[PDB]
Structures are given as structure tokens and as C-alpha cells.
């Protein structure tokens, strides 16, 4: 719950900064949904959207980036802003299969 959102926020930060992230397949799916959700509000780009995005992402510089940088770039697409690609690689320990998450473009 609060543990998940903390993760999402951490993952989304790195994703918007470097452009890609790698995690487990499940965590990758959950993340893609969270980010698509944030970009949607950024595209709606209003007083209330900016409020909800910040409450979700506890980082101003990023919320700022989303609205005036990432959002404009996806004004043509209407969803599926994030791409998830399953790897042939599995993490060490449990062997859970990995997946690479990145912004479509």
C-alpha cells in the first residue's frame, strides 16, 4: 500500500530522469500503470492535475518536468506511453524473470 507507492515514486523518478528502469515483470506492470496515470494528468495539465501528481510523486522538479516537458511530447499519443520488455535474464536468488521499462518513442 504505502510501501508500494513509495516504490512507484522511487522507480518513476529514475525512469523520468534516465529514461529506463529494470525490475521484476510484476513490479514493471504496476509501474507502467502508475506512470501512464501520471502522464495522463500532466496532459490534462491543470491546477488540480498538478496537485494530484505532486501528492503522488513527492518531488517538485519532476512534477514540473512532467507537465512542461514529458506531457507536451505525448500530446499526440492517447495512452501506452510506457513500454515494457521482458528479458531473458532472471535475478539471482529466487530467479524471478526481469523486464525493462522505458518511455515509448
CATH number of the domain enclosing 58: 3.90.1030.10
Is the Cα dihedral 62, 64, 65, 67 positive or negative? positive
Q: Domain limits at 30?
A: 1-105
Listed in sequence order, the DSSP H helices in the chain are 2-18, 25-44, 47-56, 60-65, 71-73
Is the Cα dihedral 62, 102, 37, 80 positive or negative? positive
Name which of 105, 102, 97 is nearest 20 in CA terms.
Answer: 102
The structure was resolved to a resolution in Å of 2.3
Rounded-to-integer distance, Cα 21 and Cα 98, Å: 11
Rounded-to-integer distance, Cα 19 and Cα 102, Å: 6
Contacts of 101 (CB under 8 A, 6+ apart): 11, 15, 20, 21, 22, 23, 28, 31, 32, 82, 83, 84, 85
Number of independent structural domains in the chain: 1
Please give the distance of CA 17 from its chain centroid, rounded to a whole number.
Answer: 10
Amino acid at each position: 500500500s504505502s510501501h508500494r507507492l513509495a516504490l512507484y515514486r522511487n522507480q518513476a523518478k529514475s525512469l523520468l530522469t534516465h529514461g529506463r528502469i529494470t525490475t521484476t515483470v510484476p513490479k514493471a506492470k504496476e509501474l507502467r500503470g502508475f506512470v501512464d496515470h501520471l502522464i495522463h494528468l500532466a496532459k490534462r495539465g491543470d491546477l488540480h492535475a498538478r496537485r494530484l501528481v505532486l501528492r503522488d510523486l513527492q518531488d517538485v522538479k519532476l512534477v514540473r518536468k512532467l507537465f512542461d516537458e514529458i506531457a507536451p511530447r505525448y500530446r499526440d499519443r492517447q495512452g501506452g506511453y510506457t513500454r515494457v520488455l521482458k528479458l531473458a535474464e532472471r535475478r539471482r536468488g529466487d530467479g524471478a524473470p526481469l523486464a525493462l521499462v522505458e518511455l515509448v518513442e
